[PDB]
Amino acid sequence: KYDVVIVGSGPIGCTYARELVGAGYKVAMFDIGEIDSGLKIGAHKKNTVEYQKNIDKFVNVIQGQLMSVSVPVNTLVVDTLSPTSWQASTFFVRNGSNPEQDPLRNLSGQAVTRVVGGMSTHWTCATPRFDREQRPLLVKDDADADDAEWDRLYTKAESYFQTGTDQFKESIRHNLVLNKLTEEYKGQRDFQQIPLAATRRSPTFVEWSSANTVFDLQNRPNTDAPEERFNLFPAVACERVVRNALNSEIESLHIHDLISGDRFEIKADVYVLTAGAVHNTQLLVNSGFGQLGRPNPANPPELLPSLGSYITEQSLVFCQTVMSTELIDSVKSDMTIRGTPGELTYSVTYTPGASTNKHPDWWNEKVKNHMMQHQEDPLPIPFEDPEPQVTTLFQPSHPWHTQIHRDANQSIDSRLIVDWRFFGRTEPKEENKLWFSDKITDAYNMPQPTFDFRFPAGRTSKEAEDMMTDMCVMSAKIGGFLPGSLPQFMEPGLVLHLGGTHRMGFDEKEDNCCVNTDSRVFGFKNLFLGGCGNIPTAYGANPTLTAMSLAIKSCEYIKQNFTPSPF
Amino acid sequence: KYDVVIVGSGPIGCTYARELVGAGYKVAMFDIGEIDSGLKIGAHKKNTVEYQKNIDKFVNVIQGQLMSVSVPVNTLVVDTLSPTSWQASTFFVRNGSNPEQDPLRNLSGQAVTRVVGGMSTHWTCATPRFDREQRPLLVKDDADADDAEWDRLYTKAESYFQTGTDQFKESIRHNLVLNKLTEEYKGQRDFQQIPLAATRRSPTFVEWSSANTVFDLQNRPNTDAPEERFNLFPAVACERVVRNALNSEIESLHIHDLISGDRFEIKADVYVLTAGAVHNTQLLVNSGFGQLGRPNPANPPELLPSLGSYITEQSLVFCQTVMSTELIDSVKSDMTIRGTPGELTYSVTYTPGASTNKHPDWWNEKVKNHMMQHQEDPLPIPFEDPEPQVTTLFQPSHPWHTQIHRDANQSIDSRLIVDWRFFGRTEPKEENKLWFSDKITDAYNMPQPTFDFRFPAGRTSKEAEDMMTDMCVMSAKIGGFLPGSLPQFMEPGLVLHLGGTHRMGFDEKEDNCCVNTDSRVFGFKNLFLGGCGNIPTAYGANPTLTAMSLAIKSCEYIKQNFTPSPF
Amino acid sequence: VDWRFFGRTEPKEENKLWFSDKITDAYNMPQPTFDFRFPAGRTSKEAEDMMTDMCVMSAKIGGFLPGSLPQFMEPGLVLHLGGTHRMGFDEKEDNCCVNTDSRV
Amino acid sequence: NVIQGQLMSVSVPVNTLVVDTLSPTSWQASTFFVRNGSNPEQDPLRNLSGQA
Ligand SMILES: *Cc1cc2c(cc1C)nc1c(=O)[nH]c(=O)nc-1n2C[C@H](O)[C@H](O)[C@H](O)COP(=O)(O)OP(=O)(O)OC[C@H]1O[C@@H](n2cnc3c(N)ncnc32)[C@H](O)[C@@H]1O
Ligand SMILES: *Cc1cc2c(cc1C)nc1c(=O)[nH]c(=O)nc-1n2C[C@H](O)[C@H](O)[C@H](O)COP(=O)(O)OP(=O)(O)OC[C@H]1O[C@@H](n2cnc3c(N)ncnc32)[C@H](O)[C@@H]1O
Ligand SMILES: OC[C@H]1O[C@@H](O)[C@H](F)[C@@H](O)[C@@H]1O
Ligand SMILES: OC[C@H]1O[C@@H](O)[C@H](F)[C@@H](O)[C@@H]1O
Ligand SMILES: OC[C@H]1O[C@@H](O)[C@H](F)[C@@H](O)[C@@H]1O
C-alpha cells in the first residue's frame, strides 16, 4: 500500500515522482522495461564518452529500442524461392503483424520504448515552448492569466529538464547557419538556438538531460534523502486499473511481474498513468474505459467516449544539405592567406581585435590554427567544431516547427552537412483514432493497438505541403541538398509526437475530452494521466516540455487534495 | 598501489579477476568504456524481457557498439551536388578515415567495443573446444599430457561461462534440422547442439552468459565477499605500461581519466592486459614494444619483433535458407487431420505412445495444440519455438567450424528461416600485420591501427572456397536459399575472431612469438597478456573459450609466484 | 507528372573537351576527356534558384513522388552540350571557330 | 530501354570501388588499374559523367 502509484518511468512519470516524492508522499513507480543506462538510472544513453566520440553510431541505439506499434500484414511477393522451399498460398498473418491494421490508414512509423526512463534515454532533447496558437487553454477568457500560468509552469519544467539556449554558442557551423538565415529573412523571421535539455561539460562533451535529470530514480529513503519514500519496480507490466461501481474512484492497480511471472494488485490513494500516449490508452481500454475493439458508433461507449479519438500526429519533412562554397569561404574572410598549403612559404594570418574583422578573435584563432596545423585539410572549420542547433520557431505565418541541426537519428565531409526537419501541426478530428483489438493481443498479452488515421484534408494537408516548400526554400540559402537525403515526407508517426489520445479540456462533453486541466480523469477522484496524450491542440513544436508543464499543474492539484501518510 | 592491475573488463579480464580476487589479491581493473548493461555490471544486453520478445531488434545494439578499426579514405564520386555546394578537388582525408590504410589489404569488418564487459555484452555465446589440429601445444613431446591439460582448463572455462549443450533440446525447429542433417550424413559427419554459454530460465527466456557470469564486477569488500578486494574503474583509458631500462619489469601503468581529464600513474606487482586483440597490441606498441610506424624490415624492432605479425582472421561465409516443404510436412507426420481449418468439426489428433509415431509425445502435443489453437496459421511449428542451434564441428576432412542457427546479427515466416555460418582457419604468416601509425591517431589520441592483411594464397584460400561449397551443399539438405541472403563471403574481419597479434609459443625466437605458455611476456617478470591475440594457430572455431583456458593457466602461474598483500 | 528544369551555363575558357594523345576510344580515335565545372557565379546561383523554383512550382500540382525526389541529374545526362566549336563574327575577338555561315 | 541501349558514355573515369567480399581463390589486383574501357585521363571530379 502506497500514497501514490505511477505507471511509467519516462520523463513525465519522473515529473510526478520529483513533485510528489519531494512533497513527502510514499511513492511506488512501475515500468514494464528494465534498468539499462548504467548506474544513473533512466539517464541518456548518449552520455558516454564513446558515443560522443562516435556519434554516428547512436542511431543504432535509437533503432534498437523503437518497437513498432502496428505492423500490417506483409503482401510482398517473393517468387525466387527454390522449388523445394515451403511456401504458403496466401499472405497469412506472420512475424508479428496486426491483421486488424489497414496498411493505408496507419501510422506505420509509430513505435514505443520499454526501458526505464522511456524515450528520454534516447531523445534529441529539444524543449521549445508552445505559443498561444499551439497551446491548450488553462484559463478560459483571460489570456493574461492563461499566459501567467503557462509561463510559471514552463519555467519550472525548464528547470527540471535543465533547458538552455547557450550550449552551442561557440560552434562555427552553428553561427554560420544562424547568421546567414537571419540575414536572408530580413527581420521577417527570428532564428535562435534550439532550446535544449542539456548541460555542456567540455568543448567536446554535452550531458544530455533525461528522466534521470528530473528524478534520479534511486530508492528512498537514502543517505541523501533520508525522509523521502520511493520505490522503482522495473520489469512490471501494469495491466488494469480497477474502477468502483460508481466510476468515481480507482481501487487498485493490477500488475504482472515479468521476472517471477506472478500477478499482483497494488493499492494506492492516487493512481498516475504515464505509460506514453499509446500505452496509457491501452491500459485504460483494458480497464473498461472507452470501447474495446473496432469502433462501432451504433454502440458509443459510455465511459470516456473521446478516449482514443482526435488523435494527432505531426507531418515531418526532412532533408540534408551541403554547405555552400560562399559560406565556407566566409569562414576565413578575415584571413590573409599567402602561398600554397603544405609548402614553406604558406601563411595564414589575421589582425586580432580589428574592428573591420567579421568574426571575433576566438573564431579567427580557431580557423588560423586549423589552417596552419592541418595543411592537408581543405576546409577552414576545425575538426571538433560542435554541430549546428538552429530553429525558427512556429508562427502564424509559418505554422511549423523547424530544426536545422545535426541529429543522430560518408563521401561528403561531415562538417559540410546540415539536417533540416520541419514539423507540421495536425487538426484534431474525431475520425482519427487509436483503437485496440478485442481478439488480437500484443507481445505482453494486452489488446493489440490499431490505428485509423489520415492527415486531415483542409488546413493540415495544405500546411504540410507549404511546409515542405518552406524547407526547400530555406535550405537553399545554406546549400544544395545532399544526394540520398533529398526532401521527403517521413513515414507517418516516425516523428513520435503523437498527441490527443487521452485529451485534456474544460468540459468532457463540450470539449470532447478525457481529462480536465488538473489532468484528472473526468468522474474519478484519484486517477490522473500524464503525457503527450493529454495535449488536445494542433501543435508543431516538440511536445514533451508542454506535457511536463501539465504534469506539474496536475501535481499541484494532488498536493492540494491528498495528504501524505506519516513517514 | 594494488597487487594486480587488469586492463579491460571483457570476459578474459574477468577471468583474471575471478581467479585473483578469489585468491585474495588486491585487484584494480580499468576499462576505457562505461557501465551501461543495467544493475548486473558487464552482463549480456540481450537478457531483457523486451529483447527476447523482439529479438529482431538486438542487431541494432550490436551495430551500435562495433566501432570500425581502420577505415580507408573514401573515393566514392558524388557528382549530383548542387553547383552552389562546396566541393573539394580531391579525395582528402575525412570523416575519421585512416590515410595509412590500403583499402585492398584491410580487415574492413574489424571493429572494437568499448563498454564494461566488452564484446561479451552482445556476443552469440558459442563456446566450442578446439581439437588438436586447431590448438597450440601446452606440453611438448607428450600428446596425452597435452590433451589432459587442455581438458582440465576447458572444463574450468566451461564452468566459468556456464557452457551447456542442452538448452535448446525442446525446440521443434532445432531438432528438425539436427535430425535431418544427422540422417543425411549418416556415418560421415556428426551433428550436435552448438555449445552455448547460457542458462535457460523458461521456455521463452535464456540467460545468456557474459563477463558478468564469469565475475560480477561489484567492488569488494562487500557483504557477500567481506574478505575480497576489487575495484572497477570505468571511463579510464590506459595508455602505457612503463618498462624499466632493463626491459625486465613493468614499473607502472599510465591511465587517463576520461571524465575528469587527468592522468595518473598506477603501481601494481602484476600487470595484466586484456584490452582485446587490437588494443592490447596498441597499448604495447605505445609503450615501446615492437615498432611504431609502417613496418621497416631494414630496421627490425628490438623488443618483441613478432608483435603484430602472424595475425590471423577467419574467412566467413553466410547464407540463410527457407525450410523445405518435405521438412515442414514431416513435423506433423503423426497427426490425423479431419475437416478444414476454421470449420466447427476440424480435428487434429494423434495417438500418444503409438509405435508408428515418428516423434515423441511432447512434440506431437505442441504441434496438435498449435494447429488447433491457431487454425488461421498454415505452419505446424508453434509460435514460441526456440531457434535452431546446430553444429558439425571442425574435422580434418571438413576443416571449418559451422553454425546452423539463428543469430541476432519480413515477408517470409521466421519459423522457416535458418542461418548458416561457416568459419575457416587462416594460416599464420609473418606478412599479415597489424601496425600503428606514427602520425595518425584514433579517437582516444592513441596511434591509429592499420592492417596489412590478405588471406594466404595456398591452403587457407583453397579451404575457404571449399568451405563455401560445403555450405551450399549442406544447406540444400534443409531448404533453398532465402532471397537477399544468398551465399556470400562476409567482409574481412566482420567475424571478429582476430588472433595471433601477440602470439603464444615456447620460444620467443623459434616460435616467432610474444608470450610463453603462462601468457607472460618474454623477458618480463610481471607482465601478462590475455585474449585471442595469444592464439598462434590457424583455427576455425570461435576462440573465446580457448582464450579463457589460456587465462586460467596464466592465473595459476600468478598465484604461484606472487604473494597477495596482507588484508 | 515529370518536372525538368534546365539551366543556362556561362561559357568559360577553362571548361574544355580535349582528346588524349595516347588513349583511344572503341573506334581507335583519340579518347575524349572533359575538364568541366559549373561556373561559380551566375551559373551556380541560377542553378540553385532553379531547383528552388521547381520545388515551389511543382507543389502547386502535387507532392513529390517517393523515389523521384528533387535532384540534380548527373552532369551531362541532359545531352545539351554546346560551344565545342563555337560560332562568332571574329575568330579572335569572339573566341570562336565558325562564322555566322557556320564556315570554319 | 531503347534510349539507354544507344547512349554510349563519352568519358568514364577509372573505377575505385572496393570489392572486398571476393572469395580468397579469385584473382585480384593490388591496384585500381585501367579497366573496362575507362579513360585514365579523366578526373572523375571535373567530368560530364552523364555525357553520351
Ligand atoms: C524516440 C525519440 C523520442 C523523442 C526524440 C527523438 C527520438 C528518436 N526527440 C525529442 C525532442 O527532441 N523533444 C521532445 O519533446 N520529444 C522528443 N522525443 C519524444 C519524447 O522522448 C517523448 O515525448 C517523451 O519521452 C514522452 O515521455 P513519457 O514519460 O510520457 O513517455 P515515455 O518516454 O514513452 O515513457 C513511458 C514509459 O512507460 C512504460 N510503460 C509502457 N507501458 C507500460 C505498462 N503497461 N506498464 C508499465 N510501464 C509501462 C515504458 O516502458 C516507458 O519507460
Ligand atoms: C561482437 C561479437 C562478438 C562475438 C560474437 C558476436 C559478435 C557480434 N560471437 C561470439 C561467439 O559466439 N563466440 C565467441 O567465442 N566469440 C564471440 N564473439 C567474440 C567475443 O565476444 C570476444 O572474443 C571476447 O569478448 C573477447 O574477450 P576479451 O576480454 O579478450 O576482449 P573484449 O571483450 O574486446 O574486452 C576488451 C575490453 O577492454 C577495453 N579496452 C580497450 N582498450 C582499452 C584501453 N586502452 N584501456 C582500458 N580498457 C580498454 C574495452 O573497452 C573492453 O571492454
Ligand atoms: O525523428 C523525429 C525526431 O527528430 C528530432 O529532430 C526531434 F527533436 C524530435 O522531436 C523527433 O522525435
Ligand atoms: O557475426 C560474426 C559472429 O557471428 C556469430 O554467429 C558467431 F557465433 C561469432 O563467433 C562471430 O563473431
Ligand atoms: O534526359 C534529358 C532530356 O530530357 C528531355 O525531357 C528533354 F526534352 C531533353 O531536351 C533532354 O535531352
From TrEMBL, chains A, B:
Q: Which residues does the record give as FAD binding sites?
A: I12, D31, V115, G118, M119, H122, T124, C125, A126, C238, T544
Record keywords: Oxidoreductase included?
A: yes
Top EC group: oxidoreductase
What stretch or stretches form a coiled coil here?
A: none
Q: What is its EC number?
A: 1.1.3.10
Query: Which coenzymes or cofactors are required?
Result: FAD
Identify the domain of life: Eukaryota
User: Which reaction(s) are listed as its catalytic activity?
Assistant: D-glucose + O2 = 2-dehydro-D-glucose + H2O2
The GO molecular function terms of this record are: flavin adenine dinucleotide binding; pyranose oxidase activity
Q: Where is the Glucose-methanol-choline oxidoreductase C-terminal domain?
A: 495-551
Q: Which UniProt keywords apply?
A: FAD, Flavoprotein, Nucleotide-binding, Oxidoreductase, Periplasm
**A cellular component term, taken from the record's GO annotations:** periplasmic space
Which Pfam families does this chain map to?
GMC_oxred_C
Localization per Swiss-Prot or TrEMBL: Periplasm
Under the heading PANTHER family, the entry gives: PYRANOSE 2-OXIDASE
Protein family (similarity comment) = Belongs to the GMC oxidoreductase family.
Q: How does it assemble?
A: Homotetramer.
Q: What is this protein called?
A: Pyranose 2-oxidase
Taxonomic lineage from the root: Eukaryota, Fungi, Dikarya, Basidiomycota, Agaricomycotina
Instruction: Please name the gene that encodes this protein.
Output: p2o
